[PDB]
Design a protein around this nucleic acid. Structure first.
Ligand SMILES: [Cl-]
Ligand SMILES: [Cl-]
Ligand SMILES: [Cl-]
Ligand SMILES: [Mg+2]
Ligand SMILES: [Mg+2]
Ligand SMILES: [Mg+2]
Ligand SMILES: [Mg+2]
Ligand SMILES: [Mg+2]
Ligand SMILES: [Mg+2]
Ligand SMILES: [Mg+2]
Ligand SMILES: [Mg+2]
Ligand SMILES: [Mg+2]
Ligand SMILES: [Mg+2]
Ligand SMILES: [Mg+2]
Ligand SMILES: [Mg+2]
Ligand code: NA
Ligand code: NA
Ligand code: NA
Ligand code: NA
Ligand code: NA
Ligand code: NA
Ligand code: NA
Ligand code: NA
Ligand code: NA
Ligand code: NA
Ligand code: NA
Ligand code: NA
Ligand code: NA
Ligand code: NA
Ligand code: NA
Ligand code: NA
Ligand code: NA
Ligand code: NA
Ligand code: NA
Ligand SMILES: [Sr+2]
Ligand SMILES: [Sr+2]
Ligand SMILES: [Sr+2]
Ligand SMILES: [Sr+2]
Ligand SMILES: [Sr+2]
Ligand SMILES: [Sr+2]
Ligand SMILES: [Sr+2]
Ligand SMILES: [Sr+2]
Ligand SMILES: [Sr+2]
Ligand SMILES: [Sr+2]
Ligand SMILES: [Sr+2]
Ligand SMILES: [Sr+2]
Ligand SMILES: [Sr+2]
Ligand SMILES: [Sr+2]
Ligand SMILES: [Sr+2]
Ligand SMILES: [Sr+2]
Ligand SMILES: [Sr+2]
Ligand SMILES: [Sr+2]
Lengths: 145, 246, 119, 115
RNA sequence: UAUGCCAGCUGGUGGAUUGCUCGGCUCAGGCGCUGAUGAAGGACGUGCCAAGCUGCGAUAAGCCAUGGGGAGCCGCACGGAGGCGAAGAACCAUGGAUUUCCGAAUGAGAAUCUCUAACAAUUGCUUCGCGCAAUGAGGAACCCCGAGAACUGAAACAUCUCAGUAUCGGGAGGAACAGAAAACGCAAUGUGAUGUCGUUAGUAACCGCGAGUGAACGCGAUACAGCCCAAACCGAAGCCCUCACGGGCAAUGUGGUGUCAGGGCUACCUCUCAUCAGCCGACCGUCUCGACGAAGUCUCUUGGAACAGAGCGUGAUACAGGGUGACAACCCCGUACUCGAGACCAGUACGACGUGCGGUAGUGCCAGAGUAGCGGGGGUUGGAUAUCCCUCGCGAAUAACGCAGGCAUCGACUGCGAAGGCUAAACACAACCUGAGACCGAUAGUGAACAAGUAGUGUGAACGAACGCUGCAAAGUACCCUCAGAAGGGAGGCGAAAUAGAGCAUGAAAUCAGUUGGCGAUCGAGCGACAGGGCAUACAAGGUCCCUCGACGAAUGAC
RNA sequence: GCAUGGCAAGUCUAACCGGAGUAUCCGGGGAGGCACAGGGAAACCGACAUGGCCGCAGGGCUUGCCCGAGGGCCGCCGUC
């Protein structure tokens, strides 16, 4: 049995005095009425802030953490196994509709990896090299200068 | 497990591997959910005329003549819900979404589960079907498809100690209620489901309570009419194998 | 259609030429064999046996066939009015069976004897 | 108000075992499964690898998922595993149903709850 | 015990309830224009008797032909009389005939009539003559182009909102509109006409930066289709009417060429299956209609009736639905299978006829002006500097040029050729046809299951109800008595039932008549709850209860 | 938000297409959405698959002592 189903006989259906559930006055106005007066509480404050650059002058980088790559090495058997070599571009989803691929250094790297990507974060390298690995900046990647 | 194959004479003619799906654990909640959705999805949208009760310039006189403020026209009360000939306050609405969604995985799981309920004589018997057989579902040679006469299928079912269920379904019920006024005077027990592979069995379809289907598209309702698992079924050598990859 | 309202409606409002089928009656065993039909449209000449009402068991000549009301009068199947006069008690052909045909009409006979068509 | 027949049976069996054998885990696990689904455990392998030890049955009062790497040779007992979870686990150890565990160890001894 | 209170009984009143459904409501598919050759609508006629509805039109519920159909028929409508039908009627399909008056209403006028040959009025062509033609008005909504509110929201209110909504003017079609880039701008080595659907997204953008408003490119789909002029170069090589003769148009340019894969011209190579025009002309599919179509009407019992129960039997590519005196696959219509016709798809697709694609070199020959663009003032938009449009004013270039890429200018780069035009399909609606339903079931559902837009209200615009059910069969009550009496009453007849006898299935409550129980003319008012007494009570569906004594015997507790 | 259920580092298809028992249903369709990294107006940069200590449930043991998921208090890391 639901709450609705139990209201017959109650008269007020939970509204309290039958003088309560009328028009918008019972809501202090329609929509966001009073968001600066009677109901200012918890509302974001009023005002303009910042600016936006045109959407076609904006770059969307496709990112990935070493942790993701590293935990799936053996499974990514369909990619180089040298002294592993992996072109991150062939790993990241959304890499297509992105302006470039970037390797971030979140997590650990328990293997020696030769990563190929358009860009890496300082920590991404330190960890990769740290595990006797290497980092190869793609041709596009050659946009840092 | 293995299932016995039968020839059109009712004699055993070898046997095959009962596909793994028939091992799927029976899940009546998922099966019921699946049947509930298929049943809802074929319901038609309805609702009263949106202007019903509203075609009137009826006005209220307000205070003054010792009468309640009810819209009236030609001395007759109108429009409002409490008024006879007035509008319906909260009537059936056409814009209402009367369909039910169901994830493909969840639906397919119910199909497999309904399939598995078909291989359990105890369940099949609990569902209500009448028969003197022990092995279930009933598997038959693909020649079954070449049959043409209904009475031929009758002979085969009797030879298989399964015709008893058709006698069960050979009783129609004249329902209580006004369904009758809308074309739903009768209803009847669900009997044997015949699952073939090329085309539904034209020869078996007219049997009392019988349902015909094809391995490629047999659904949860076929296998569990009303959402009750364990329907007495009869597969076809090929149907059995094809149904395995559902 | 399958809807009861439409079925009865199509029957009550069927044009005249479509009402002949509302006055058809099953044929005796012999007649069915003779003309290869299970039933026929009762004519004011046929002989018929009543198989269901209070007059079940009686046989007589058909004296009238009303298409407007889809009923037939059969000789001796009557009711006695208050004054005493004897009037016919209308019968639904569905409760009757033809035991002898009136083939005085070549078109009818030809129709019955044909195979592709039935009378 | 559970709707799944098997989940109900599992809970019933978990209680029978706890009331008739030297194991308070089963009943404990039964109590957690009786709680709303949102509270049930949803554990990835990475967590089992961090707190599990060999020859100690890992018991998950919920479902095991496939994120992370499991190397330890442990037996994981859970209400359910994702396809990948059960695969990675069977490789270096073993994946078993809470129904099997209850049968091989009704006393519920040498076991660690992970959530 | 009067007047009277409470409850019930018999009979009314009333029409709830239950059951029933010729009507609604909603959804889906199909289909889709009519009219001066006088539509749609209205008026008045039209029947043996004819008021209403339906039909029809002085040939008047109908006339003719072809096919279907069939022994009956003369609509709703169950009468009387009479007639028609084997000279094949009724009925149905297709085609044709007739088709009064008003009505766009068109000779002039007029509340449906009148007065003295008429396309009235506006147009095009023109034989300059109404000679040949067009327009006008209708249609449920859908569609296109214009005009354009307020209540309301913002808790007031003015910008904003409601909303380009309601409503108004004009106009087309079966669909409309749009549409082969002076595009896009995931900026690219990229996309490639246009609708529409999903998404992009409540994103960008707007906004007393409040409340609110709100795209696009792209992507996934549906369906796919591209072409024609102006000019250059030609210059009468041409078009329209007429059978013809003949006439009219046309140098202010008919016709050829050509159309951003730019074109033309001069000089060449090669070659056409592009395009444009015309001819032929479907399959299939979908919708509707139609033909054919299996097997019990066997026994006994109950009943007014078997379609019930019990017994025996049968068909099924048919166990959808309906009808028939009660629960019917097998009694009748249908239903499955198979077959036929029309409509739509579609004058489309294919096929065939003709035409002829394209490439090289040269050539500043051609390529749409109040335009592109700028300014003043307005409206509008998400359009913000960067939407679209109106208005006033100003105002260019000529492809070696010009426009666009979300502020202006200049260069570069990429895209693209405005100021001419046409264009199938995929999408909207629901009048019309058919199908369908966890919709309503006669105070419901349409206002309308019935006389329904009826009766009726208002000067008018406009407003607007209520009314469903005898029975299996009318067997719809003969004869007799009574009475002023075709009334009514009594008796009687029919039927299973008249307490089924006409708003005639059932027949609640309020309530009325008569009557039964209890109370009652010395007595007090939330009408009762709980206890306990009186009186009343056919059966059934409840069977307990009382007194002596004894056993048990909590709290409490004696003489 | 919550209860139940499927799947899970993923999940769900939308329009629409094919099939069919033809509005149901079977297959297909991942366009796109949300989740898988945040911080910053922007430019731009880009994180604990665990380092310490308490300790509930549960487990272990020689029955106070160990292990102690979740939780609690800190460290430390990304960015302004
Ligand atoms: Cl930005
Ligand atoms: Cl986890
Ligand atoms: Cl593009
Ligand atoms: Mg109403
Ligand atoms: Mg009922
Ligand atoms: Mg014959
Ligand atoms: Mg006139
Ligand atoms: Mg206001
Ligand atoms: Mg449009
Ligand atoms: Mg304000
Ligand atoms: Mg707006
Ligand atoms: Mg755009
Ligand atoms: Mg405005
Ligand atoms: Mg009504
Ligand atoms: Mg009555
Ligand atoms: Na109230
Ligand atoms: Na009205
Ligand atoms: Na709906
Ligand atoms: Na149409
Ligand atoms: Na009349
Ligand atoms: Na006519
Ligand atoms: Na004219
Ligand atoms: Na003229
Ligand atoms: Na206000
Ligand atoms: Na005010
Ligand atoms: Na504003
Ligand atoms: Na793309
Ligand atoms: Na009958
Ligand atoms: Na605008
Ligand atoms: Na201007
Ligand atoms: Na552009
Ligand atoms: Na009524
Ligand atoms: Na008493
Ligand atoms: Na996707
Ligand atoms: Sr409340
Ligand atoms: Sr109000
Ligand atoms: Sr509020
Ligand atoms: Sr304030
Ligand atoms: Sr994508
Ligand atoms: Sr007053
Ligand atoms: Sr008639
Ligand atoms: Sr009639
Ligand atoms: Sr195209
Ligand atoms: Sr041009
Ligand atoms: Sr710029
Ligand atoms: Sr009434
Ligand atoms: Sr209506
Ligand atoms: Sr007035
Ligand atoms: Sr009498
Ligand atoms: Sr005592
Ligand atoms: Sr999916
Ligand atoms: Sr922690």
């Amino acid at each position: 049995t639901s709450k609705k189903k139990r209201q017959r006989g109650s008269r007020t259906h939970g509204g309290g005095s039958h003088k309560n559930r009328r028009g918008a006055g019972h809501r202090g106005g329609r929509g966001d009425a009073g968001r600066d007066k009677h109901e200012f509480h918890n509302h974001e404050p009023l005002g303009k802030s910042g600016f936006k650059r045109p959407q076609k002058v904006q770059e969307e980088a496709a990112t990935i953490d070493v942790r993701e790559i590293d935990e799936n090495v053996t499974l990514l058997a369909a990619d180089d196994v040298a002294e592993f070599r992996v072109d991150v571009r062939d790993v990241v989803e959304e890499a297509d509709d992105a302006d470039y691929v970037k390797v971030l250094g979140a997590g650990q790297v328990r293997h020696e990896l030769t990563l190929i990507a358009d860009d890496f974060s300082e920590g991404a390298r330190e960890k990769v090299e740290g595990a006797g690995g290497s980092v190869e900046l793609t041709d596009l990647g050659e946009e840092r200068q | 497990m293995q299932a016995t194959i039968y020839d059109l004479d009712g004699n055993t003619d070898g046997e095959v591997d009962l596909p793994d799906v028939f091992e799927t654990p029976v899940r009546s909640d998922l099966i019921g959910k699946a049947v509930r959705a298929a049943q809802a999805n074929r319901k038609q949208d309805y609702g009263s005329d949106e202007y019903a009760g509203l075609r009137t310039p009826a006005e209220s006189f307000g205070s003054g003549r010792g009468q309640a403020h009810v819209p009236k026209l030609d001395g007759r009360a109108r429009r409002v819900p409490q008024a006879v000939k007035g509008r319906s306050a909260h009537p059936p609405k056409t814009e209402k979404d009367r369909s039910l969604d169901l994830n493909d995985k969840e639906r397919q799981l119910a199909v497999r589960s309904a399939l598995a309920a078909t291989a359990d004589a105890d369940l099949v018997a609990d569902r209500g079907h009448e028969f003197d057989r022990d092995e279930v579902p009933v598997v038959v040679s693909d020649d079954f498809e070449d049959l043409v006469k209904t009475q031929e299928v009758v002979s085969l079912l009797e030879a298989l100690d399964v015709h008893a269920d058709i006698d069960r379904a050979d009783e129609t019920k004249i329902k209580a209620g006004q369904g009758s006024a809308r074309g739903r005077k009768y209803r009847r027990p669900a009997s044997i489901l015949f699952v073939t592979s090329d085309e539904p069995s034209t020869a078996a379809r007219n049997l009392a309570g019988a349902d015909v289907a094809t391995a490629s598209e047999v659904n949860t309702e076929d296998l569990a009419p009303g959402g009750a698992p364990g329907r007495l079924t009869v597969f076809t050598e090929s149907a059995l194998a094809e149904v395995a990859e559902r | 259609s399958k809807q009861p309202d439409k079925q009865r409606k199509s029957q009550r409002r069927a044009p005249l030429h479509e009402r002949h089928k509302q006055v058809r009656a099953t044929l005796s065993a012999d007649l069915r064999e003779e003309y290869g039909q299970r039933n026929v449209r009762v004519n004011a000449g046929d002989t018929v046996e009543v198989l269901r009402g209070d007059f079940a068991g009686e046989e007589g000549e058909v004296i009238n066939v009303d298409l407007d009301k889809a009923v037939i009068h059969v000789e001796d199947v009557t009711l006695e009015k208050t004054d005493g006069e004897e009037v016919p008690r209308p019968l639904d052909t569905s409760n009757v069976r033809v035991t002898d045909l009136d083939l005085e009409d070549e078109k009818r006979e030809a129709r019955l004897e044909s195979e592709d068509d039935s009378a | 108000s559970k709707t799944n027949p098997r989940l109900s049976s599992l809970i019933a069996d978990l209680k029978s075992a706890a009331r008739s054998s030297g194991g308070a885990v089963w009943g404990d696990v039964a109590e957690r499964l009786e709680k709303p689904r949102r509270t049930h455990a949803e554990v990835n392998l990475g967590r089992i690898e961090r707190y599990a030890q060999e020859d100690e049955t890992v018991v998950v009062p919920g479902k095991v998922l496939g994120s992370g790497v499991l190397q330890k040779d442990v037996t994981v007992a859970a209400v359910d595993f994702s396809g990948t979870a059960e695969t990675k686990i069977d490789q270096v150890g073993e994946a078993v149903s809470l129904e099997q565990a209850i049968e091989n160890n009704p006393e519920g001894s040498h076991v660690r709850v992970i959530r």
